[PDB]
Amino acid sequence: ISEV
Amino acid sequence: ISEV
Amino acid sequence: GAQVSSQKVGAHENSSTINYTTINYYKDSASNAASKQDYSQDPSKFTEPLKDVLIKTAPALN
Amino acid sequence: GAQVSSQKVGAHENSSTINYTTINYYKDSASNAASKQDYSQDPSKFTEPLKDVLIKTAPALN
Amino acid sequence: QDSLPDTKASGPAHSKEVPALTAVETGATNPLAPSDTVQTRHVVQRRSRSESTIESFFARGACVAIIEVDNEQPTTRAQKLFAMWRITYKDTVQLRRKLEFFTYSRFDMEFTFVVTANFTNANNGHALNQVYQIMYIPPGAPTPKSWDDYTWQTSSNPSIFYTYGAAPARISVPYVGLANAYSHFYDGFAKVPLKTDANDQIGDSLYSAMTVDDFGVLAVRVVNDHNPTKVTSKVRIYMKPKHVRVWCPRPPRAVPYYGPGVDYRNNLDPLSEKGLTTY
Amino acid sequence: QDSLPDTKASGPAHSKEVPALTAVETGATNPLAPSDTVQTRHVVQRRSRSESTIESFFARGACVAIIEVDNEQPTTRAQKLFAMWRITYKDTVQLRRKLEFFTYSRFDMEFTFVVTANFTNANNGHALNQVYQIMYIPPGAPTPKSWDDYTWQTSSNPSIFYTYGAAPARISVPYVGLANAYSHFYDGFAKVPLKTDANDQIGDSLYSAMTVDDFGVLAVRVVNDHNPTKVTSKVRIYMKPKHVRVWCPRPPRAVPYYGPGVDYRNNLDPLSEKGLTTY
Amino acid sequence: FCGSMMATGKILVAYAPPGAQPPTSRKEAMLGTHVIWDLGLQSSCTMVVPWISNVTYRQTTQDSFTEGGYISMFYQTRIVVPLSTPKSMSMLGFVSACNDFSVRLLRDTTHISQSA
Amino acid sequence: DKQRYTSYANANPGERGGKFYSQFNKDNAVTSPKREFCPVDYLLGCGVLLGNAFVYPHQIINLRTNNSATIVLPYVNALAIDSMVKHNNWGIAILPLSPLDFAQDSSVEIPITVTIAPMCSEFNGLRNVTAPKFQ
Amino acid sequence: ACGYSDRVLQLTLGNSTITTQEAANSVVAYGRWPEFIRDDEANPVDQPTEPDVATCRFYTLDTVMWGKESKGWWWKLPDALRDMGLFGQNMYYHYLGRSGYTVHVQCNASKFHQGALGVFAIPEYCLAGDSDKQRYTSYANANPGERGGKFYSQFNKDNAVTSPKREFCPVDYLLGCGVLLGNAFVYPHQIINLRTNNSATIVLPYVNALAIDSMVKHNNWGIAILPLSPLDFAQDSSVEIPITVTIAPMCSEFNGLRNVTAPKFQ
Amino acid sequence: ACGYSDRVLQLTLGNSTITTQEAANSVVAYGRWPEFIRDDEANPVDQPTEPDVATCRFYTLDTVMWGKESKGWWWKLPDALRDMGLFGQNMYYHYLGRSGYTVHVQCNASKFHQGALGVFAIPEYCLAGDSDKQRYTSYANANPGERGGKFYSQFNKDNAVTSPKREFCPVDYLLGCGVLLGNAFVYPHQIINLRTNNSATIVLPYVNALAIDSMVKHNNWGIAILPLSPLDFAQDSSVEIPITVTIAPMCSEFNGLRNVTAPKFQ
Ligand SMILES: CCCCCCCCCCCCC/C=C/[C@@H](O)[C@H](N)CO
Ligand SMILES: CCCCCCCCCCCCC/C=C/[C@@H](O)[C@H](N)CO
Ligand SMILES: *C(=O)CCCCCCCCCCCCC
Ligand SMILES: *C(=O)CCCCCCCCCCCCC
């Protein structure tokens, strides 16, 4: 996943 | 998982 | 491949950064939804397209 | 078992590598979708199937 | 962080800096803020322009076509057992006008299809649920001459088979333009008459049109064979631009549209009457 | 990274390297680029061949069969209470022609089934929703003699039970060929007449055919017992090759197909008239 | 060139990007892209039609907006043969794409059909 | 009444340019149609209001203030290069925002001269010359 | 310096050598030289025979004559060699056989003659029949042996629906099979253009959807020779010059020995 | 080994390519390849235009026919190109112009024809007039454009002293200017001798006593083609074969732009  |  | 971003919260419950999750399911980017996390810009190219841009306190014609 | 790959982006929103995710749900590979990440090759076996391949600047018949 | 700028507190002035005077002859807009001409207090500004980004201004499905197609016994007369629509946003006016705030655009397109049907005759029995085929025919591919000829085999053209009563069908299409952006306005011709042309027809073309077939057509048919009672359907097509970029702003259309070009004809009087000194 | 090669800048030449002359007698195509015969500028090339890979050329469902099946009272005459289709891509022409750009192929096959029904008689009451059984009968398995005999028990053959109005049914099948690739063309016979044969029928077989039953048949029936009114349905079958490899390219079919072999009969004149010196 | 070995000749083959009168004489044809072919032991000559286009992709149907130009061929001197040699002969022509060529938007062909 | 019907020779006046009108005068000789533009001034000749033309690059020559306008134009198109014969990239429109007046005379006239210079010109696709039919 | 040219070649296989002094290089079809079945591609389990020099040698077929009205010639492989020495014997004694080939087509004329032959090697060369009945050419007619067949300029349908001929009717501009002759250049080929060369040499790997098959039932390759530009000479109206085809089996292996197959041809 | 020969050449300039398979090497006149004016040799001070590929490309003039009684042909440069595409436009819009040239003369025949053409490139090729009046050839007659002029075998004096023709009368063995043709070999030249070659290629630097001059008033080079040995074939008495001249400007630069020069030729 990749939180921004 | 496996990113390519 | 999950993307996690913050929501801009409007009304708040009597309960902080609330997040939402997105996964793209298709290979073609045309299938994607819109992220609507859109940046803006300066109107100058329309409001001041002058070769010598002058400061508003100075006379426009010198 | 999630495979994550990059999409080749065409039109861009006014918002980078956008990815998409795939999981195979069936044991038989015939059930799989197509990945469409396909490599190509050289046409030479059809365009130049000559025993002595000569360079284009040199005479073809020497 | 997307809020607009804060108002700064400012007090009295007695000086040689004169922001209130300017010369609009230069072609520039005077960038004043209220604190340049009045005393202001400090205000921490929290408003944002989130809903007027180019993406949010266009992020709506807009109706662009209503296609009518029938399912009845193939007679010898002209019928509507299949229908063809040349793809365009210029058959309706509302989305056309929003796109035409700009000269060029680049976007992907989402199409959603709403299908409704009704009986026309009081009764000749009924009808079983219909399946619709919407086939895209790109410029150059063969167009159907009858509702079940070979073109409907669709081996290479994309088709949607929609079942009546299911959720509206929906597909996305990439930026498919031949140029680096779509031209909403083209000041030119597709042909030029030359002095050596045999006659004047050879170099004649329509002003401001580009290709002839543009994006092709959608061919719609009911796949079912006919029932004894006739059933009429309409397919309504909604277009939504997504992943939108636009260039070179234009005045919006102010008088009714008259065709696919910029021509006008009637109601050339958009402004109403109001006295110069009436609030 | 999949873009085509960049154009290199090149200038004038006066030399003994002569890329413009060649001898096509050798069997080779001259690999020239524009910079071999004209002055070019540098161009950073961004186009790609993404849409003409073998997978993307075949990645479409193409119609290969329309099977008609009825649900009505079993009379004593010939009816269509069940139908059988010998599996093939040669009953239609569009997918046949694309596969026949190649001599051999290896792929998995996706089948999607679109089913439509209608009433035929003005009215004898109605019909409740129909369920369809599509049974695959491989070469050698017993074929049905009536719409509800024991073969429909399907203990080992695979069947699809499709409910009218549901999304089109879909299944995948592996590469099931008896050889290491499918032969789109077979220059030979399945039998040879020998000198010691009792008569000429014994060694006679059709030119270019291989097995007799090929891939078997699909047997389709409506599972419901009949209503008082008759209901006719059509099952349209769409084939899409996936995970495709192909070998030995061929000229494409240029005159109409005349059967499952390469035979021709009419319209042997594909090219139109054009003057030698007319643009 | 499929004439005898004793035949000689020079030929001008040209490409005119669109927008002007289609060449009717060598004089007009030689102002565009061209190759002057000298017949001899190397039997064949290649002219490359460079991609010269306004749009980034042209249509495969005929459209004046995406028209591609004109190919013409003229004698630069003439075919000359000695006595006892055929005075006429065939020329054959071949076409192929260069390595910068691509296509897009798959569609059905008009080159095959099926009647009911 | 015919849409998109202005002919190539009429759409392209050359250095002569064209003029605006105060009202829509429809060509009625449906027999030998003129196939001309009819640009109405307060509609900027194209169905929008003249007052909003200020979103386009512009200057005003207001006679009490200045006697010239200078505007530098980049090439703008949806393509990097195009046919100059078929397509015009830019239009220059000069309209009296406030009409000419002098002393108390009723027929003052003063010249307007337009001088234009190509910049960063590049051309591709050489062949024989195009000769358009204008007359 | 010492003088090697792609116009002068010597080919030696078994006890036979070919020389040519006016070649136009040589083609190795699809870039693949012939080879034997590898163990990991093997399918029949019995030990194969590999006659080697007894069968892999040049066999010359009967010469055909090229005249001004010739429309073309075709042969199928292995059929054209079915009666050639020990290659034919091994072919008929074994259920299965595999072979690649070197094809050398010979046609010399003079510096005052002109004409161009297209020599095409086609995998699975299915040809069209002569009638309304589909796929009806008989085994004996589909397989002419070294005699080969001919092309025609037009479709002449066999009408004796009583005693049908069951022959092919190969129309030349349709390559005998419903495609346009001009696109035959996607197949391995050379051109014998008389001003340039007097021979064509093409090396053919075994091509099939199987590692080995029945040579009696199935032809792997077809050789089609068509006048792309017709023969002409001086100002004579009936010039004729020979065309001779010499073919050598390569990497021959056979499986499934038993009694000999004797096909009925007549 | 791979095969480069001084008989086979390709010349590419702008969008035009020339091939020849029977050249006799190529001449670079006086050993000098063309070049632009260097700053230390510069004289007009305005920035020059250098159209580059738009003008430096091969222009083919109208073909002339060589028959048994032909005496020769001559052209002057830049005059022969004054109406050629954008080279002519730049020439007439500018007071000053400078250019070098590649000249390619084409003449093929057969192995049974014979004859030899001398191709000479002459700096300042002044030609002699047709009358008793000296230096009287008019501008329109001295400058034939791409049509060029011809040589004669003898001096034919214009006698209509009333309406004088004011033409050149170039006698061939005197090279049209009072010297013997045999010594023309001190000028850059090639011979097209039909048994040996079918073309001549000569590269010409700009030669003048000034770095740049008026192209409208002054021709820098003359091209003279004379039959050193007359055309002959088999035993026919009226053989004719084409001669085609293709010339490309090289390193063109122009100075002094204003309105266009329109000379009066007719
Ligand atoms: C199965 C249904 C498939 C539907 C496929 C539709 C393909 C075409 C999409 C076109 C979107 C058009 C937007 C408008 C562009 C125009 O402004 C300009 N004339 C282009 O220069
Ligand atoms: C419940 C439905 C099951 C359907 C099962 C179908 C099985 C058969 C799939 C066949 C795909 C055929 C493709 C064509 C192959 C042919 O070209 C060649 N004749 C094989 O040598
Ligand atoms: C990034 O994607 C890491 C893994 C995310 C796991 C959840 C996936 C949910 C299913 C996606 C299926 C897409 C279509 C096969
Ligand atoms: C790799 O697969 C790691 C785990 C992925 C987790 C998400 C799974 C989503 C459900 C798949 C079910 C398949 C059928 C039982």
mmCIF file of C-alpha atoms and ligand atoms in Angstrom, chain E residues 87 89 105 107 109 111 113 134-136 158-160 171 173-174 176 181-184 210 214-215 218 239, ligand 1:
data_model
loop_
_atom_site.group_PDB
_atom_site.id
_atom_site.type_symbol
_atom_site.label_atom_id
_atom_site.label_comp_id
_atom_site.label_asym_id
_atom_site.label_seq_id
_atom_site.Cartn_x
_atom_site.Cartn_y
_atom_site.Cartn_z
ATOM 1 C CA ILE E 87 -20.266 10.351 -32.065
ATOM 2 C CA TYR E 89 -21.069 16.349 -28.127
ATOM 3 C CA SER E 105 -8.585 19.777 -24.402
ATOM 4 C CA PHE E 107 -9.092 13.820 -21.564
ATOM 5 C CA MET E 109 -14.057 9.712 -21.789
ATOM 6 C CA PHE E 111 -19.747 6.692 -21.527
ATOM 7 C CA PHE E 113 -25.811 4.149 -21.371
ATOM 8 C CA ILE E 134 -24.001 -1.219 -29.146
ATOM 9 C CA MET E 135 -21.134 -1.633 -31.647
ATOM 10 C CA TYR E 136 -18.481 1.034 -32.203
ATOM 11 C CA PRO E 158 -15.720 -3.340 -29.626
ATOM 12 C CA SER E 159 -19.380 -4.042 -28.760
ATOM 13 C CA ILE E 160 -21.391 -3.818 -25.510
ATOM 14 C CA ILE E 171 -17.059 1.926 -20.506
ATOM 15 C CA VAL E 173 -12.094 5.299 -23.774
ATOM 16 C CA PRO E 174 -8.525 6.768 -23.857
ATOM 17 C CA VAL E 176 -7.915 9.012 -29.083
ATOM 18 C CA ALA E 181 -5.017 17.798 -27.993
ATOM 19 C CA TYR E 182 -8.661 17.810 -29.276
ATOM 20 C CA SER E 183 -9.486 21.070 -31.148
ATOM 21 C CA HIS E 184 -12.758 22.560 -30.070
ATOM 22 C CA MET E 210 -11.521 18.655 -40.094
ATOM 23 C CA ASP E 214 -14.497 12.243 -37.090
ATOM 24 C CA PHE E 215 -14.746 9.517 -34.415
ATOM 25 C CA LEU E 218 -22.244 3.808 -32.649
ATOM 26 C CA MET E 239 -20.433 11.481 -21.573
HETATM 27 C C1 LIG K 1 -18.414 0.251 -27.178
HETATM 28 C C2 LIG K 1 -18.537 1.817 -27.192
HETATM 29 C C3 LIG K 1 -17.208 2.497 -27.567
HETATM 30 C C4 LIG K 1 -17.294 4.021 -27.754
HETATM 31 C C5 LIG K 1 -15.975 4.539 -28.352
HETATM 32 C C6 LIG K 1 -15.972 6.049 -28.609
HETATM 33 C C7 LIG K 1 -14.666 6.591 -29.234
HETATM 34 C C8 LIG K 1 -14.592 8.118 -29.478
HETATM 35 C C9 LIG K 1 -14.456 9.010 -28.226
HETATM 36 C C10 LIG K 1 -14.508 10.491 -28.602
HETATM 37 C C11 LIG K 1 -14.559 11.566 -27.494
HETATM 38 C C12 LIG K 1 -14.776 12.868 -28.295
HETATM 39 C C13 LIG K 1 -14.497 14.240 -27.674
HETATM 40 C C14 LIG K 1 -14.451 15.321 -28.737
HETATM 41 C C15 LIG K 1 -13.410 15.648 -29.547
HETATM 42 C C16 LIG K 1 -13.506 16.750 -30.600
HETATM 43 O O1 LIG K 1 -13.610 17.906 -29.814
HETATM 44 C C17 LIG K 1 -12.420 17.263 -31.668
HETATM 45 N N1 LIG K 1 -13.253 17.325 -32.857
HETATM 46 C C18 LIG K 1 -11.135 16.432 -32.029
HETATM 47 O O2 LIG K 1 -10.131 17.215 -32.693
#
